[PDB]
Design a protein around this ligand. Structure first.
Ligand code: PIO
Ligand code: PIO
Ligand code: PIO
Ligand code: PIO
Ligand code: LMT
Ligand code: LMT
Ligand code: LMT
Ligand code: LMT
Ligand code: K
Ligand code: K
Ligand code: K
Ligand code: K
Ligand code: K
Ligand code: NA
Ligand code: NA
Ligand code: NA
Ligand code: NA
Lengths: 328, 328, 328, 328
């Protein structure tokens, strides 16, 4: 079955018929850092080689129009750049200058102002281009989405009874010793619907409660946590029994958002649970054990669940039993 | 008619009679990065050329006061900077030094401490100025407002019935495959008012509810979303019928705020719906279709709406019909 | 009278008897960027001059222990660094190397590995020190608190009647065309108190409501806004009449927090209203006027207020009149 | 007794049996900046020395395959790099080039394109590697967790009566004159539990209320603040008397999260109070005193508490006395 979101977090959507494609060029920086690495590294190589060529020809051109080329056998003549024997030497000086290596076998001189104003322009644009590209690299290396790689979601969501309440539970973890700051968990139920009046709504998102009113959706996440959605009157699973579950066409999107401790930058880790990955009547297997001075987590057991005695009834039907029980 | 906010997000306000203009110089960095590009690139060129000139004259000056200029025919004499034949050579050494190209035809020496302490000062201020300016460039290129270019708002807001409730709806979209992290939507109604007591309040902002109490204002925005404001008792559209709408003098400001995935930086995309852009009795045309392995969006249809059967009554009058219907 | 917070935002508190002062050295970066500019620029100059000296002596030392110094009249002998005639030349090479100007009159050679491993160490530490310091500069220039300079608070808070409710109002503004993203306003009442049991609490902070439950504390701030605190049953001004106000010993701290549009960084602008700056029975003078295509703000009038007819009674006593009025 | 969180903020947990260790390499930047300094500085040294060697051999190799090595006695022959007498000179040119010191005793030439395309590759990768590493340093120096060093938590939590309510109180402070922006305090109670149905939950986190519904959890923190948790019906200390406290097996985790004023980056300071550090019947000793123009804090007294008359009863039992008192 098709899902909206993959277990690893990527989203199965393509944006077609974007009539106004120039917008991608309007915020070029976003397109650049969003590219695949091969394409950054390609552009990176190109941006540098074309500038050095582009200036290299302008350095050659000053030397040509000046007549430096024509008098190389005459020492009386002095050029813009000492030693520009040909079209190759210009390329090298062009790099020697803009990288600011400037070996100084090729050296500029007093004799032309035409050259000085180029060295000037170059150095300036050399800084602006170099910023743009190095900046682009730094951002791409340091970007926070990468942290998501050391944030795990449990492979299944489970439904079982907890202190008399029927609960939907998934487990989350963080493989690093460092932290997710201002950590928080939110969850969205994704399923299509139809209004009384006729409107079909493709992949309708309804927020699932996972601590919003108590601030228990704000996580302190060191050892793995089991996030619990209590299936109450206000739940979208209120009228879903063990029987009905597999015949429902729904998907739970789970989103973990906080700041990578070292870069202040906010990360978003995502995963999905489709109807078949929601185990009814199950419990997560413990992972925590005590050792001398430290609590040790056993990630082998992180995804593992086991079965428990659990009603087949919808949460709603459990209430109906309770209403008669308290009234008895 | 005059609007407060343009559809593209820019705001029609000018800040006149700012008596204390020095404040703009107090936080210079904000003024700089807020400038138009022509003016950054201008200042950028200028800041660099004046330093190189300013030092170039000081390099010339040491050479003049020392008497290096007077003895160029004497090799016994050795200068601060080998080869400073005139006022031009000094400018070149000044750049050769501060860019740190340092071709080394112009080379400093032991003979003057006067020169060494300059090379010292220069290099230090060369780093501080270079930071300030390159930094200023980097910030301006990477700034998040730019993302707003690949965030679209629907061209109209529509009002129609949804599961028995009258709703104001606008649609939002994101043209990129990358994400808006900690995405959230808020909306402000802008219209003037008068208190019982007499006070006129120019462009009074009252927050429009778009999910605040359920956290459904926190968006997971991949494919386009239709943001719904339920027009209930607490709504500012409670007493507005189809008839009255066009004769109201109001404007809805819509604000999308989240973090650009790659730079942790927060973006704010804005748009406005003036009274004439609010289509009563309309529905948004679907955009989502299924393809092999991927959900495809059709942005051609993004802004498109169609008409449906919809009451001409205000939400309030619909309730009055319901009160008698339930009491019947 | 002593205030806790100045009108410009600075806080009248000193942190004395910090026994564990090393902590300031533990997070050195915070102390550095928190310093006055004179002291950054001082340290900046020093950090660079001591490294260049420190290496300069090590460059001199290799040259001394090797015996390069003793043979300068012998060309057969070749040194670590060509041309190190004395203790001054070493300082210059040391800079020429670490700034990477490297004029190359002073050039390293094959003949000693002792020199190569220094050039190596230097270049590496040259990058680490240069990062630390340039970074420190960049941060300090770009820091967001500076924006606060172009965020104004009204000079007074006023109390007057608004649609039958008694309200405490202050006005806020933003002098720039650019934005404060995720803008929000919160306000704290600061006054001492005593518990029934005996405990004196020095400067007790109680949050003042300014939109928290409706999200109207989240500002869209283009033209100036009048922030309104409705003085209701839950207000700390519930039992304060015009008469009692000046004899109360209290201070309202007002805090504006949002993100500078260009740097994603969060700014905090603060101000205070002491009991004497709270004008009872007053209204803010309008500032907004319409011009062709643009709304123009008149900051001359920003702080200005005028008097209106307003009850001398506490909000509580107004309710008591209303209770008998509705019961009549 | 074992705690979950240390008083200084570090967490007693180890992540064992991480089967998928490659993920650490997938987001390498996080692993790098998370390393101990010795290991950054080690890698930093290594990354640079291996590139310079790696290129140095390629520079040597071009010189070898070309036959430059074989003709050093022939001036007719001209090499890729003037002066590459051996395997050592190549290493030096390799650094001279990539650091961009380029002393220019070793200079590239026209004669080989083989060399030019290397200089090209090098300079490009020289920028990418240099970014990666300097960036990594900058991040690590500027990271916000460090601020936590100048944020103190009181050594004990105390329980005493405040205006008729039994309260759990701890005190927090900030040693710097600079601010924590968007400051906020949250607190989690950590103790194991067992569901009716059988499920043991290892270290169950239940959020402790410390201002969430009034926004008094949002701190304006200049002088020290006493954070108060009112022990009401909804409290986890509702049924805990002075008698029972020490026999409970619980731990309160306290978390302070806000932005370092200068870097926009968010900091998280943590501490813990185990059952024995919760003083029943105690009050914090004042720290604030007035001086000419400034409020002075006395951090000697910051942690100090003193005893007061305080009920031995649980908050619940105090209510039961009140129920009969009001009914009397
Ligand atoms: C030369 O090869 C470049 C090498 C591999 O990168 P390569 O060219 O295969 O492209 C990367 C690849 O597509 C990953 O799958 C992407 O990660 P994710 O799956 O989208 O997370 C990644 O995007 P982002 O996620 O890095 O933007 C892409 O850049 O990386 C250095
Ligand atoms: C040489 O030309 C510079 C070239 C065009 O820029 P130019 O000088 O026309 O100035 C830009 C122009 O005014 C845009 O309309 C602005 O974008 P927006 O409409 O305000 O979004 C932009 O401001 P910001 O938005 O970039 O601050 C301005 O910088 O850009 C490289
Ligand atoms: C050479 O002079 C340096 C020159 C003036 O700076 P100076 O040395 O007088 O020191 C600044 C001065 O104390 C300001 O009042 C401070 O601003 P604020 O009043 O605290 O806002 C500022 O602190 P921050 O606010 O910049 O940290 C201080 O750095 O600035 C370039
Ligand atoms: C050469 O020595 C390097 C020197 C000391 O650092 P060293 O190598 O001892 O390693 C640091 C040490 O382990 C600290 O205890 C850590 O701080 P915290 O206790 O974990 O806060 C710190 O980690 P982080 O906290 O900096 O990541 C470690 O880097 O630092 C310059
Ligand atoms: C004219 C400008 C055209 C290029 C604009 O920049 C372009 O952005 C789009 C959207 O992220 C990317 O589009 C990419 O993902 C989409 C899914 O939405 C694929 O259908 C497409 O084949 C792929 O190239 C391009 O890889 C990138 O090059
Ligand atoms: C003395 C210092 C004066 C310069 C201060 O910096 C200045 O800031 C203001 C406000 O953003 C900008 O002002 C700009 O927008 C305003 C609208 O508010 C226009 O009316 C004005 O014509 C235009 O220049 C200037 O372009 C900029 O140069
Ligand atoms: C041993 C290390 C001592 C230096 C520690 O770093 C130090 O931090 C404190 C607190 O911000 C600063 O202290 C500064 O403000 C305090 C107010 O709290 C003043 O009373 C003090 O005279 C002033 O120097 C110092 O200017 C700074 O140098
Ligand atoms: C194959 C790749 C293996 C290396 C991966 O990177 C590795 O990350 C883990 C988790 O933070 C660190 O692990 C570190 O803390 C854990 C606690 O969880 C200790 O038990 C371990 O002895 C210590 O090395 C390593 O110091 C680091 O080198
Ligand atoms: K250089
Ligand atoms: K150089
Ligand atoms: K050089
Ligand atoms: K040189
Ligand atoms: K936030
Ligand atoms: Na962790
Ligand atoms: Na998207
Ligand atoms: Na503004
Ligand atoms: Na402080």
């Amino acid at each position: 079955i098709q899902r909206y979101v993959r277990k690893d977090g990527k989203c199965n959507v393509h944006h077609g018929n974007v009539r106004e494609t120039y917008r991608y060029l309007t915020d070029i920086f976003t397109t650049l850092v969003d590219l695949k690495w091969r394409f950054n590294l390609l552009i990176f190589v190109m941006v540098y080689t074309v500038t050095w060529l582009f200036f290299g020809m302008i350095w050659w051109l000053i030397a040509y129009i000046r007549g430096d080329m024509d008098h190389i056998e005459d020492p009386s003549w002095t050029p813009c750049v000492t030693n520009l024997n040909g079209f190759v030497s210009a390329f090298l000086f062009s790099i020697e200058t803009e990288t600011t290596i400037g070996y100084g076998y090729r050296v500029i001189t007093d004799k032309c102002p035409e050259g000085i104003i180029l060295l000037l322009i170059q150095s300036v644009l050399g800084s602006i281009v170099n910023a743009f590209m190095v900046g682009c690299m730094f951002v791409k290396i340091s970007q926070p989405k990468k942290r998501a790689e050391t944030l795990v979601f449990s492979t299944h969501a489970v439904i079982s009874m907890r202190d008399g309440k029927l609960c939907l539970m998934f487990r989350v973890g963080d493989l690093r010793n460092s932290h997710i700051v201002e950590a928080s968990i939110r969850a969205k139920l994704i399923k299509s619907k139809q209004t009384s009046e006729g409107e079909f709504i493709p992949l309708n998102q309804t927020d699932i409660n996972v601590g919003y009113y108590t601030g228990d959706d704000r996580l302190f996440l060191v050892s793995p946590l089991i996030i619990s959605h209590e299936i109450n009157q206000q739940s979208p699973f209120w009228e879903i029994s063990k029987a009905q579950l597999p015949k429902e066409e729904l998907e739970i999107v789970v989103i973990l958002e906080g700041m990578v401790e070292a870069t202040g930058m906010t990360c978003q880790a995502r995963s999905s649970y489709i109807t078949s990955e929601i185990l009814w009547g199950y419990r997560f297997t413990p992972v925590l054990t005590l050792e001398d001075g430290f609590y040790e987590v056993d990630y082998n057991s992180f995804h593992e669940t086991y079965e428990t005695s659990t009603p087949s009834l919808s949460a709603k039907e459990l209430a109906e039993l309770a209403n008669r029980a308290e009234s008895n």
